[PDB]
Ligand code: SF4
């Protein structure tokens with residue numbers, strides 16, 4: 001399963017959803033998650049993230065391990081997203097800011 005980590009929060013570019021063959025992304029107010037049972041690990045989404053927020057589950061940074069379980073839990077309650085939309089308005093002010101998990105909205 002591929003995992004979306006911190007730098008997606010408040011950027012949410014959604015570029016990643018075009019390339020997913022199986023529509024494994026689920027949508028929240030300011031973040032996306034990958035559903036782990038649906039992901040076929042094709043890796044096509046992680047070159048497409050401008051915020052370079054997607055990782056293979058086995059490559060998630062040590063200080064971002066919470067995001068593996070977070071993707072699995074929020075994909076169960078968030079709506080599936082299958083079309084790209086505009087990035088959130090202030091997405092490049094927040095691109096690259098560390099510590100954005102405190103800003104996640106359910
Ligand atoms: S690795 Fe593939 S199947 Fe998984 S979310 Fe990404 S594009 Fe989709």
Ligand code: F3S
Nearest residue numbers: 008013014015016049
């Ligand atoms: S910022 Fe997020 S919405 Fe997708 S393109 Fe990157 S994982």
